[PDB]
Amino acid sequence: TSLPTSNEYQNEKLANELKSLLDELNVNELATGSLNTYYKRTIKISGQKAMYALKSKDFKKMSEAKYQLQKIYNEIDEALKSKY
Amino acid sequence: LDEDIIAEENIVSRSEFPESWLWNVEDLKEPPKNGISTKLMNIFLKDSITTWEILAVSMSDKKGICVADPFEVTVMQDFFIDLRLPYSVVRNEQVEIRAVLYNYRQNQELKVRVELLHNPAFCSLATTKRRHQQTVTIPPKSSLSVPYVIVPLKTGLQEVEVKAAVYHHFISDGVRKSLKVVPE
Amino acid sequence: CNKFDLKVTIKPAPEAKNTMILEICTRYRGDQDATMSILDISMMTGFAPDTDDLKQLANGVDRYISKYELDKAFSDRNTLIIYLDKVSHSEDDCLAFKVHQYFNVELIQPGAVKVYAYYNLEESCTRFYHPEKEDGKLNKLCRDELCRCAEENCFIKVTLEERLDKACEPGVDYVYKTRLVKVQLSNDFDEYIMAIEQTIKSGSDEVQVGQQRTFISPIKCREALKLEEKKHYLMWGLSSDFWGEKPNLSYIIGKDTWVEHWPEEDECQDEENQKQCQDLGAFTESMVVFGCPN
Amino acid sequence: SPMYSIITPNILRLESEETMVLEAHDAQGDVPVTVTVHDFPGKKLVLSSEKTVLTPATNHMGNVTFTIPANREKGRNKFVTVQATFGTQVVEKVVLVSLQSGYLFIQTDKTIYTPGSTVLYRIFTVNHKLLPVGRTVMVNIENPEGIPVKQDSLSSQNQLGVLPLSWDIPELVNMGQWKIRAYYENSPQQVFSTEFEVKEYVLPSFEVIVEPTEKFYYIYNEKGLEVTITARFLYGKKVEGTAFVIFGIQDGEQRISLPESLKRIPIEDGSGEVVLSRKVLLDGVQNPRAEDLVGKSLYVSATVILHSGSDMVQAERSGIPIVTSPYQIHFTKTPKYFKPGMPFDLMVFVTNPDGSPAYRVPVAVQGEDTVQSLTQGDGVAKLSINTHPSQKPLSITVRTKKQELSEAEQATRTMQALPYSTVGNSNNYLHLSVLRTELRPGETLNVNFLLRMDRAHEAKIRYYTYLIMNKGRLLKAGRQVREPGQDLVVLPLSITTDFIPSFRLVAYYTLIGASGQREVVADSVWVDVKDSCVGSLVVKSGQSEDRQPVPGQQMTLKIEGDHGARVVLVAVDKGVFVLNKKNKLTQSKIWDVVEKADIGCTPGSGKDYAGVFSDAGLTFTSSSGQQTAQRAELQCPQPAA
C-alpha cells in the first residue's frame, strides 16, 4: 500500500489519541472514589462523551471530547496531589 | 445509552444544598507584602446553582475588627434543573411538585428526556421496572416547567430526585432535594 | 381547602378522536369577592390548550393571560397560568377550553388545577383531573393510616413451565389454590374473603389449610377481574403484599401477584379447558414433591 | 506665678488604659509629679504607681498612662477623685466613671433559619478602641416572647476576640424573629443583641426589587408615584413572569392600604413599570385634601410569579416620604458658638428625604446672594461667613438653591450661634480654621491657629497646647509653638488610620493679663474622616480570569489582609437574603456603634473656656482653680432639639 489522504491521516490520529485516553479511563473513574462528588459526577459524563464520540468517527465530537476528558483527567491529578 | 445522549446510570445528581457553609477560620501567617498578607484558599463550591455571597471579618489585635465587603461568586450552568420542593407535605396527600428546566444556551432549543426517579416512599408514576420520562422541548433563554404529581407515603424525611439529559449535546444534570413529610 | 372551591370537570367533546373539554368551577368562600387570583393549570402529559380558545379568554375582561404565554406554539404550553381579576364569593365562576391530546402515550399523568389570591399562598386549593382515574387521585391502597402504592397493573400463552419459572423467583413466598367466600365492595377499596384450599408453598403466613385470609384491590381494577364466589383460584405473590401485623394479616392485589381462574370438577370435562386443567395438576405435584429448581 | 493644669477624659473606663495631660506653665527647672486615683468618697488608693517629671526639655508637658481595676465596689453613678501632685503643690478633680467595658458584635450565618436548622454565631469581643480584648461574656438566646431558652458563659481569652458558637433550633418552636443577647460579665446593663427570624420556607430562585424613580413623592406631582419592578434569578439572569403591585400610606407605625391601587403588570425582560396615581390615593382612603398627608410615607408591595407557576417572590419598598421639598437641611454637624469678628465655617448637612446625603446641591445664607457652595460626596457643604464683633446672637438661616426648583420647592432651616464668652469680657479669642474636605489617613491636614487679642499681651503667648479625642479617648496631646506678632500658625497634622472614624481637636493657651488675671482661651473642632476598616480585608477571586465555575467545582479564594490577622469566613446562598436581609453585620454598623458612644456632644467650641473642655470629652483642672463644670451625666444632653 501507499500513504493515507489528509482527512485520512488527521482522522486516524485524533481517534488513536482519543482511544489512548479511553484506555486508562477506568483507572481514573476509580480514583474519583476518594475525591469530592464533583469529580465523579464529572468524569462519568465525560467518559460517555468520549466512547460515543470515538465510535462516531466524526472529527468534532472526537476532539471536543478528546479535550473534555483531558481536562478532568488532570482535574484529578491536581486533586490527588493536595492529599499525598 | 449510545443514543446522542447521556444514560441515567451515569448522571450523578447534585444533592448538597446548604443555605450556608464555609464557616472556617484561617490565619494570615504569610510573609507580608506591602504590609498586606495574602492567603490563597482552596474551597469546593457547593452544588447549588445560584449566587454565593462570601462574608469575611478580620480581627487583628493591632488593626482591629475588619468588615470585608461582601464578595460575589456566581455558580451557573447553561442547563440545569430546578427542583421546586415545598416546605412540607402531608402523608397520603397527593400534591404537585414543579421541576423547572432552565436552558440558557444563546440559540438552539433543547430536547431533554427528564426523568423522575422511582421512589419507594412515593406513589409517583414511577415503578421498580417502569420509569417516568418525557422528551420535552425548552426554547432558548427560557424555562419549561415539568410538573409531577406525587403522593408522600411514609413520614419523616423523604427525597425527591429528578434527572434530565439533552440530546446530541452530552450535557446533563441530576438533583436530589429532600422535603418533610408530616403526619395527619 | 375551604377558602376556595374547585370543580374540575374533564369530559370529552361531541362531534382527532382524542380531544377533550376542561371546565373549572371556582368560588371564594368569603363575604367579599376575592381580588386578583391565579389559575395554575398543567396539562395531562400530551395534552395542550387550543390557542384559539385561550386568546378568546384573555380578550375578555375580569381575566388576562400574559402575552408571553399566548405566544408559544399551542404545543409548547405544557402548563399555564390564568390571572383572574375576581372570583365571586357568591356563585361558581366557571370557564372551559378545548384541550387536545397531540401526543400518543400510555400512562398519561393527572393534570392539575391550582388557585389562590396573590396576597396569600398557603390558602390554596388543588383539584386534579383525569380521563380514566376518577378524581385526579392516583390508585393507592389504604387501611386505617398506612398506605402503599397501586399504580402498577393488576396481573400478569400459559404453560406448566411458564409457571415453574414465574412462580419461583425471589418474591414468590405464597402459592395457593383458594375458593372465594365473600365478595364485598366499597366506594374506596373492595376486598375478598378467600379461603385457602391447599397450602402449596407455605410463607411468612402460618396458615393451616382451610383458614380464611383477606385480600384487597384497587376499585379501578374491576375489569381484568370478575368473580363468581364458590369459584376456586390459583394465585401466588411476594411477601411484600402482606397487610399489617399478624395474625389478622391481609394480602395486596398488585402487579407482582398472579391470577388465574381455577376451573371446577366437572368444568374440566370440556375439550377446551383440558389444556389448562392438565397444566395445573402437574404444577401442583411439581410444587409439592420437589419445589423449585434453584 | 507658676500654674499646673490637669486634663482628662470626661468619663473614665474600667480595665482600659486612659491618659491625662500634665502641664507646668511658667515654672523653672525640672518638676517631679506623682499621680493617684482614689475611690470616691474616701480612700482606696486604686492607682498611685505612676510618677513623672516635666523637663524644660519637653516644655513641661506630661504623659499619664493608667488602668483602673474593677474591685468589689447601684443606679447611682460611681465616681473617682484624681490627684496630681507637682512637687508639693496638689491639684485634683472629681470625674465620672462607667462600667461599660466596650463593645460586642454578633454574627449569624444566615438572617433566617427553619425549625430544625442549626444557627451558627460568633461574638466578636472588643474594648472601646475596637481592639480585641479578652473578658468573660454571657450569652442568652431569647425566644420571640422574650424568654431565654438557652445561655452559656464563655471567656474570650487568647481567643483573639472571637467566640464561635451554635444552637440547634428545636423541631417544634414558635416562629418569629428571636434574639441573641450578650453582655460583659462585668457590666450586665450594657447588653448587646442581634436578631434572627425562624420561619418555614423554601428558598426562592430569584430576587425582586421595587423602585420609585424618586426617593420621595412630591404632593403636587400630577404624575403620581412611578415605580419600576425588577426581577432576576440568583444566578444572574433576567426573569419573565407577571407581578402584582399594590400601595399604601404609613403614619407613624400605622398603615393604611389603598386597595384600589392594585395593579397587575407583565414583568418583561426582567423588568416592569407601574405607578400609583395621585387621584388614586386621595379618595383611596377618602380623598381628604392633600397637603395634610405631608409628613406621611408611601410603600409598595410587589409579588412576582414566574410564568412556570413554580416560584413566587414578595418584596416591598417601605416608607417613601411625602414631601413638599426634595431636600432636608441640618445644622447638627455645625457648632453652636462663633467668635465675633472671626470667620465662621458652616457645615451644612443636606439629606435627601429618606435620610441619604445629597450630592452637588447648592446652598447659601439669607443675606448674601453671591456666596454659594456645593455639597461634597458626604452631603456636606462648607460655607464661611465673616462675623461682626457685636455681642449679639448670630442667627443664620440657610436655603437650598437648585435650578429647576421653584422657590417654594426649596428647603430651609434656621439655627442660632452665640458668641464665645471670654474671661472678664476681655475680648481674647482663639480660632482654628481647618480646610474641610474628605480627610484620609496619610493625607496631611493643616490646622490654622488664629490669635485674636490686643497686642498688649500678644508677645506673652508663646505656645498652643493641643489635644486629640478619638473613640472617646486621648490619641495625642502636643504643643504648637508661636512667635510674637504672629496671629496665624499652621499645624502639620499627619493623619493616620488611628483617627478613624472621626477625631476631636481642642487647643488652648493661657496667660496673665489685663489686671493680674489668670486666663484660659481655647477652641474645639470636629472632623469626620473617611470611614473604612482600620487595617484592611478583601476577598477577591483566585483565578485571575476564568469562566463561571460549575456546581461542585474547585475554586481558589484570595484573601488580602493585615499580617497575623484572623479571618472568619462564611458563604451564604443569596436566596436567603430574598427572604430576609436584616440584621447582617456591616463595618458601617460598627462605626455607628462607636460614634453614638462619643463622650463629646458638640460639633465644635465651648460657651466659655470651660465649655470647649466639657463639650469634647474633657476636663481641665488647674492649680489656679480654673476647673471645668464637673461631669456627672453618663449620656450626652438628652436631645432638646
In order, the DSSP letters of B37-61 are EEEEEEEEPPS-SSEEEEEEEEEET
C partners (3+ CB pairs within 8 A) are: B, D
Say whether both C173 and C267 belong to one domain: yes
Q: Give Dmax (Cα) for chain B.
A: 66
Contact D569 B25 (CB under 8 A): yes
CATH number of D297's domain: 2.60.40.1940
3-class secondary structure, C116: strand
Give D310→chain C minimum CA distance, Å: 10
Query: Which chain B residue shows the shortest CA-CA distance from C42?
Result: B147
- The reply to whether residue C42 touches residue D309, judged by beta carbons under 8 angstroms, is yes
Counting one residue from chain B and one from chain D, the pairs whose CB atoms sit within 8 A come to: 290
State whether the Cα torsion C159-C161-C165-C168 is positive or negative: positive
Residue D292 DSSP one-character state: G
Q: Do C112 and B149 touch (CB under 8 A)?
A: yes
Q: Closest-CA residue in chain C for B99?
A: C79
Of A36, A40, A48, the CB nearest to B170: A48
Q: Does C123 touch chain D (CB under 8 A)?
A: no
- The C-alpha cell 505612676 sits at D50
Contacts of C177-182 spanning 24+ positions with Cβ under 8 A: C177/C232, C177/C233, C177/C234, C177/C262, C177/C284, C178/C232, C178/C233, C178/C235, C179/C230, C179/C231, C179/C232, C179/C233, C180/C227, C180/C229, C180/C230, C180/C231, C180/C232, C180/C233, C181/C212, C181/C229, C182/C229
Q: Nearest CA to D628 among D610, D603, D605? A: D610
Asked if residue B120 lies in contact with residue B79, where contact means CB atoms within 8 angstroms, the answer is no
CB contact under 8 A, B14 and A44: no
Residue B117 is placed in which grid cell? 426517579
Angle, CA C162 vertex, CA C157 and CA C163 arms, to 5°: 120
**C255 in contact with chain B, both atoms CB, cutoff 8 A:** yes
Chains adjacent to D (≥3 CB pairs closer than 8 angstroms)? A, B, C
Give bridge partners of residue D83 from the DSSP assignment. Answer: D36, D92
- Domain membership of residue D276 (yes or no) is yes
C112/B144 Cβ within 8 A: no
Residue D437 to residue D530: CA distance in whole angstroms: 10
C66 close contact with D: CB closer than 8 A: yes
Tell me the shortest Cα–Cα distance from A48 to chain B, in angstroms: 7
CATH number reported for the structural domain that contains residue D179 in this entry: 2.60.40.1930
Nearest CA in chain A to D552: A38
Regarding whether C210 and C223 lie in a shared domain, the answer is yes
CB-CB contact of D174 with D143 (8 Å): yes
Q: Which of B25, B50, B68 sits opposite D574 (nearest CB)?
A: B50
B172 touches A: beta carbon within 8 Å: yes
Same domain flag for C169 and C283: yes
Give the Cα separation of D230 and D639 in Å (integer): 41
**Which one of C118, C120, C126 makes the best mutation probe of the D interface by having the most chain D beta carbons within 10 Å?**
C118
Asked whether residue D633 is domain-assigned, the answer is no
Note the residue count of chain B. 184
Q: Cα–Cα distances in Å, from C276 out to A67, C158, C232, C234, D185?
A: 63, 8, 14, 12, 91
Pairing of strands D412-419, D337-338: parallel
Q: How many CB pairs under 8 A join B and C?
A: 63
Q: How many CB pairs under 8 A join A and B?
A: 33
| CA distances from residue A32 to A23, A26, B165, B173 in whole angstroms, order as listed | 16, 10, 22, 18
- Interface probe with A: pick from D543, D550, D554, most Cβ of A within 10 Å: D554
Answer whether D244 touches C (CB < 8 Å).
Answer: yes
D547 shares contact with chain A (CB less than 8 Å): no
Can you give the CATH number for the domain in which D416 is found? Answer: 2.60.40.10
- CA-nearest of D375, D379, D331, D374 to D353 is D379
Give me the number of domains chain C comprises. Answer: 2
Indicate if C164 and C131 belong to the same structural domain. Answer: no
The yes-or-no reply on B/A contact (3 CB pairs or more, < 8 Å) is yes
Q: Write the CB contacts of D283 (distance below 8 Å, at least 6 apart in sequence).
A: none
Residue D640 located in a structural domain: no
Residue D5 pairs in a beta bridge with D23, D622
8 Å CB contact between D364 and D350: no
Q: Which of B115, B116, B125 to mutate: most C Cβ within 10 Å? A: B125
Task: Tell me what percent of chain C is helix, strand and coil, each rounded to the nearest 5.
Answer: 15, 35, 50
The reply to whether omega before D41 is within 30° of 0 (cis) is yes
Query: Are the C-beta atoms of D139 and D105 separated by less than 8 Å?
Result: no
Q: State whether residue B13 sits within 8 Å of chain A by CB.
A: yes
Same domain, D184 and D213: no
User: Given an 8 Å threshold on Cβ–Cβ distance, is C255 in contact with B127?
Assistant: yes
Contact A75 D554 (CB under 8 A): yes
Is the Cβ of B173 closer than 8 Å to some Cβ of chain A? no
How many Cβ atoms sit within 10 Å of the Cβ of residue C206?
A: 11
Question: If we measure between CA atoms, which residue out of D451, D435, D455 comes closest to residue D443?
Answer: D435
How far is it, in rounded angstroms, from Cα D523 to Cα D24?
20
> What subunits touch chain A, counting only 3 or more CB pairs under 8 A?
B, D
Q: Where are the alpha helices (DSSP H) in D367-440?
A: none
A38 Cα to chain D: minimum distance (Å): 5
Considering the domain architecture, whether residues D194 and D212 belong to the same structural domain is answered as no
Residue at a domain's end among C122, C138, C154: C138
Among residues D409, D219, D412, which one has the least CA distance to residue D325?
D409
Do residues C123 and C145 both lie within one domain?
no
Q: Are residues C152 and C283 in the same domain?
A: yes
- Note whether B touches C: 3 CB pairs or more under 8 A: yes
Q: Do B10 and A44 touch (CB under 8 A)?
A: yes
List all chains that touch chain B, counting a touch as 3 or more CB pairs closer than 8 Å: A, C, D
> To the nearest whole angstrom, how far is the Cα of B40 from the nearest Cα of chain A?
14
Q: How far apart are CA B99 and CA D630, in angstroms?
A: 72
Comparing CA positions, the residue from B110, B99, B102 lying closest to residue B161 is B99
How is D335-383 classified by DSSP, letter by letter? Answer: -SEE-TTSEEEEEEEEE-SSS-B-TT--EEESS-SS--B--BTTTEEEE
* Domain around A69: 1-84
CB contact under 8 A, D552 and A37: yes
Contact B158, B181 (CB under 8 A): yes
Domain tally, chain D: 6
Q: Do D171 and D228 belong to one domain? A: no
Range of the domain at C77: 1-138
Set of chain B residues whose Cβ sits within 8 Å of the Cβ of C42 = 96, 145, 147
Q: Are C77 and C53 a contacting pair, CB within 8 Å? A: no
Out of C79, C83, C119, the one facing D242 most closely (by C-beta) is: C83
For chain B, domains (ranges, CATH) are 1-77 (2.20.130.20), 78-184 (2.60.40.10)
Looking at B22-167, which runs of residues are DSSP E strands? 25-27, 36-44, 51-60, 64-65, 71-74, 79-84, 88-90, 95-103, 110-116, 132-138, 142-145, 148-150, 156-157, 162-166
Contacts of D240 in chain C (CB under 8 A): 68
Which of D234, D237, D267, D553 best tests the B interface by mutation, with the highest count of B CBs <10 A? D234
**What is the CATH number for D587?**
6.20.50.160
- Taking the Cβ of residue C79 and every Cβ of chain D, the question of whether any pair is shorter than 8 Å is answered with yes
Last residue of a domain, which of C103, C138, C173?
C138
Q: Residue D550's closest chain A neighbor by CA?
A: A38
Paired sense of beta strands B36-44 and D554-562, if any:
antiparallel
Q: Are residues C116 and C202 in the same domain?
A: no
Domain span at residue D375 reads 326-427
How far does the CA of residue B123 sit from the closest CA of chain C (Å)? 5
Query: C85-102 burial, b if ≥16 CB within 10 A, otherwise e?
Result: ebbeeeeebebbbebbbe
Task: Using a CB–CB cutoff of 8 Å, tell me whether D454 touches chain C.
Answer: no
Q: Is B48 on the interface with A (CB under 8 A)?
A: no
Q: Which residues lie below 8 Å from residue B20, measured CB to CB, with a gap of 6+?
A: D109, D110, D120, D570, D571, D572, D573, D576
Burial class (CB in 10 A: 0-12, 13-18, 19+), D484: exposed
Helix runs in D253-318, H state only: 278-285
Overall domain count for chain A:
1
- Note whether C101 and C43 are within 8 A (CB): no
- Assigned C-alpha cell, B68: 470585608
Q: What is the CATH number of the domain that holds C114?
A: 2.60.40.690
Query: How far is it, in rounded angstroms, from Cα B139 to Cα B111?
Result: 9
- Is D255 near chain C, with CB under 8 Å? no
Asked whether residue D320 is domain-assigned, the answer is yes
| CATH of residue A2 | 1.20.1270.10
Contact B12 A40 (CB under 8 A): yes
Optimal mutation site among D496, D557, D594, interface B, most CBs of chain B within 10 A: D557
Residues of C in contact with D259 (CB under 8 A): 35
Among B139, B146, B147, select the one facing C112 at the smallest CB separation.
B147
Residue D455 covered by a domain: yes
**D447 shares its domain with D422:** no
Residue D428, classed as helix, strand or coil, is: coil
Whole-angstrom distance, CA of residue D278 vs CA of residue D287: 10
